[PDB]
């Protein structure tokens, strides 16, 4: 009779995948991670 | 008689995939991750 | 009769993956990690 | 004047994605990965 | 004048993703990884 | 004039991702890793 996150629970558990494979000179950017903030995610800025 | 996230639960659990493969000079950007904020996601800015 | 994060729990447990493979001169950036802050994520700035 | 995998190169770099989301009792199987061998891919056997 | 894997190179660099999200009793299997061998991939056997 | 794995090189560098998120009783299996051998990949056997 268990209660797995019932009621008013905010259950957020997804799978987020980011993959970039490359053969050659790589100067750009590959951006992943959750980044839950304003202007989040490391970049150039 | 279990309750898997019943009631008023906000159950959000999807699979989000981002893939970029490339042969050659890569200078652009591949953008993944959840990025749940204003101007979220690392970029150039 | 256990209660796994029921009630008003904020249960956030996803899988976030960032992968970048590359053959050659790599000068750009690959950005992962959670980065839960303003301008979060190490970059160039 | 670069040569990105020219000549007799076997250049194989695709993006293969497998996603299965489900709400409820999950007893079956979701099968991904490359599995480049005879009877490859973990299963029941 | 660089040679990124030219000639008779076997250049194999793809992105293979396997994702399975589930709400509830999970008894089955989610199978990923490369598994480059006979009967490869962990299963039940 | 660099030679990044040219000639008869076997260049194998992909990104293989396996993700399984689950809310509830988890008794099954999630199978990842490369597992480059016969009957490879930890399972039940």
Residue numbers in the entry:
A (entry chain E), B (entry chain D), C (entry chain F), D (entry chain A), E (entry chain B), F (entry chain C): 251 to 295
Study authors write:
HnRNPA1 contains two globular RNA recognition motifs (RRM1 and RRM2) for the specific binding with mRNA precursor, followed by an unstructured low complexity (LC) C-terminal domain.
The density map showed two protofilaments intertwining along an approximate twofold screw axis to form a left-handed helix with a width of ~7 nm and a half pitch of ~45 nm. Despite that the fibrils were formed by hnRNPA1 residues 186–320, only residues 251–295 were involved in the fibril core. The structure reveals that the fibril core is mainly formed and stabilized by PY-NLS. The serpentine fold of hnRNPA1 fibril core remarkably contains a single but long β-strand composed of residues 260–273. In the steric zipper, the opposing polar side chains of N265, N267, Q269, and S271 are tightly interdigitated to each other via van der Waals forces to form a shape complimentary dry interface, which is reminiscent of the first atomic structure of steric zipper formed by segment GNNQQNY of yeast prion Sup35. Thus, the binding of PY-NLS with Kapβ2 can directly prevent it from driving the amyloid fibril formation of hnRNPA1, which provides structural understanding for the chaperone activity of Kapβ2 in the inhibition and disaggregation of hnRNPA1 fibril formation.
